[PDB]
């Protein structure tokens, strides 16, 4: 409703870097808000793409941002009669970023890895890796839970079980309020997908440079499966957290698996031991139900509700025809121990190929009426195909079915405006929470400031 679309703030990164592919708000130890921006194709030292991360101080005028530096060099370690190797070329550093406390986590889902032993090898594969930084102190650490040192022949002899070679850990990421980093790894266990969790504190204290393979004992990984419903499900394509079991001492995980069950798609809610509490099934095959998930209480009863994006949903139209437009599903959490039911509300896009529901961002309470609100992105939406973000306001019965406000991309065709979104943080300290929108195709980020309701 009350985001100001007249005076925006623009930040920009290098041409071709995909600056804006991911972003988050970051608060320094003093509560000063900055914006961390991933740019997963930023050029490294060897004039080769490795990705990079930027930490943008808040300024009404925006502009350029300093780098948040991470080690971009390939590593080798001969130890235990083996040769360990990391390969950072085209790793996509900054393909996801998230901030917690005064720490920043930036992931390179396509970092490759191999172990050589005489004439044998693990196979060079994208295990992915996450980099951690505490900007104020300069501390650095890494977390790469799918790295292993088993040789190729052993997987074959063991029928490819517990095969974490193609994890792409960090493909998605989130951090619990208590500081547990949770990574989605859609390629885990031969393309089923897995989650990996570990406290940020233990990641820092157990890491040392050059080791490459090390133990984080408090870590916890999800499980392989023989059930074909899970095969190629990309469980962990998206992830989120929230409170869904009524017990405030446990944190529940929300996991998107957009190709679950022969591309039907699914979203699952789990306890922190990866035991399944609920499963929402996609409505239409290939719709990519679970591409995005958001958790926020929209109807003011203190119970977290779930939103799920299916950006390729095809809506039924006149004459037995189907139009790909995308759809968002709202599920309101019921009082006490009970199942989430059918969706409480379906939101459906209008522009052909617009990908409505490609991202969904909680806004906190934008207009300050006591109900939390959301923004939904349609990165190729709008009458001109340039991209739109639509704001929907919470209300006692869930969400309004019609957008209170629509933000049209200020960038040229192809920017993917809205592909990444983040809200619910007051960056200019005016008492209203604001919205940051990534347009990686244009290597820019736009900041929309919320203003008093007119």
């Amino acid at each position: 409703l009350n985001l100001d679309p007249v005076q925006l703030t623009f930040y920009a990164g290098p041409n071709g870097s995909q600056f804006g592919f991911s972003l988050d708000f970051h608060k320094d130890s003093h509560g000063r808000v900055a914006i961390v921006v991933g740019a997963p194709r930023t050029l490294g030292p060897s004039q080769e793409e490795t990705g990079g991360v930027f930490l943008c101080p808040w300024r009404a005028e925006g502009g350029q941002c300093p780098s948040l530096l991470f080690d971009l060099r390939d590593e080798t370690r001969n130890v235990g009669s083996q040769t360990l190797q990391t390969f950072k070329a085209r790793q996509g550093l900054g393909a996801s970023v998230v901030s917690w406390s005064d720490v920043i986590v930036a992931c390179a889902p396509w970092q490759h890895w191999n172990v050589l032993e005489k004439t044998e090898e693990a196979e060079k594969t994208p295990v992915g890796s996450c980099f951690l930084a505490q900007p104020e102190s300069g501390r650095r650490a890494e977390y790469s839970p799918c790295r292993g040192n088993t040789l190729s022949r052993i997987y074959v002899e063991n029928d490819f079980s517990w095969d974490k070679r193609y994890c792409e850990a960090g493909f998605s990421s989130v951090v619990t309020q208590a500081g547990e980093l949770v990574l989605g790894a859609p390629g885990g266990y031969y393309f089923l997908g897995l989650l990996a969790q570990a406290p940020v504190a233990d990641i820092f204290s157990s890491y040392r440079p050059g080791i490459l393979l090390w133990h984080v004992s408090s870590q916890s990984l999800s499980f392989d499966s023989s059930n074909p419903e899970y095969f190629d499900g990309y469980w962990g394509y998206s992830v989120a957290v929230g409170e869904f079991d009524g017990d405030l001492n446990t944190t529940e995980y929300v996991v998107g698996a957009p190709t679950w069950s022969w591309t039907l798609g699914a979203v699952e809610i789990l306890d922190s031991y990866y035991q399944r509490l609920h499963r929402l099934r996609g409505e239409q095959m290939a719709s990519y139900f679970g591409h995005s998930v958001a958790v926020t209480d929209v109807n003011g009863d203190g119970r977290h509700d779930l939103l799920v994006g299916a950006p390729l949903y095809m809506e039924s139209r006149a004459d037995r025809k189907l139009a790909e437009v995308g759809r968002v599903y709202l599920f309101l959490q019921p009082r006490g121990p009970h199942a989430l039911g059918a969706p409480s509300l379906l939101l459906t896009g209008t522009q052909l190929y617009g990908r409505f529901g490609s991202a969904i961002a909680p806004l906190g309470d934008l207009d300050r009426d006591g109900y939390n609100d959301i923004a939904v992105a349609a990165p190729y939406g709008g009458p001109s195909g340039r991209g739109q973000v639509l704001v929907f306001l919470g209300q006692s019965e869930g969400l309004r079915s019609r957008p209170s406000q629509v933000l049209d991309s200020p960038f040229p065709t192809g920017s993917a405006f809205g592909f990444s979104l983040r809200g619910a943080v007051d960056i200019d300290d005016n008492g209203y929470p604001d919205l940051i929108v990534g347009a990686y195709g244009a290597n820019q980020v736009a900041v929309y400031r919320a203003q008093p309701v007119v």
Partner: antibody
Amino acid sequence: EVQLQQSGAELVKPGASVKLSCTASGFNIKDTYVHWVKQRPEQGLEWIGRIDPANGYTKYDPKFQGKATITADTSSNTAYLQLSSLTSEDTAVYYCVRPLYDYYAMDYWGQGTSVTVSS
Amino acid sequence: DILMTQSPSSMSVSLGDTVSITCHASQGISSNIGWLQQKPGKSFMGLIYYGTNLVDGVPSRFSGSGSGADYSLTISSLDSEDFADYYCVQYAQLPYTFGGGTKLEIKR
């Protein structure tokens, strides 16, 4: 807290066999490699081998090929070192060991099991 | 196998001294070395891993250094508890092999 609690001193005769145990305490034995090391006053410290209790895969120093058999039961959070065709020279103290962080290191040690082979 | 020649086999020193134990490998081992401590009639405690890294709980008066095939453990300002046996171990290659050991003894 990580502790490796090994079985008690053994007292056996030459030609016999004995099986020692190393029980994880405060952690899952399946988390890391578990090694066995032999110590004698004269010969010093010798690496026997290791096992990955998650899957049972072992490595040995060729010197101990034949006498030493390393096993593990994740159920009883325990790892074993079986010695066969015992001899005077098998008389020594035996330790189980696991790394702290580095996959390949040797940082945590059990209290050690004394073995004496005599007639 | 890689041979680990640890020196000296023993040394007589006193509370407060700064002493160094060295270890030489029969080939480069790129910092894949550990240092261990055995107190009289007790088990072992880890001190250092990967050349220079303190094991959790070990006081900083202990420090490890070196590269290629030559490494050193150094103890600044010896404490009463520091009189014991010390061993280096290489894990660059299987089989892991150990140094001959070093015993710190009270001078008088």
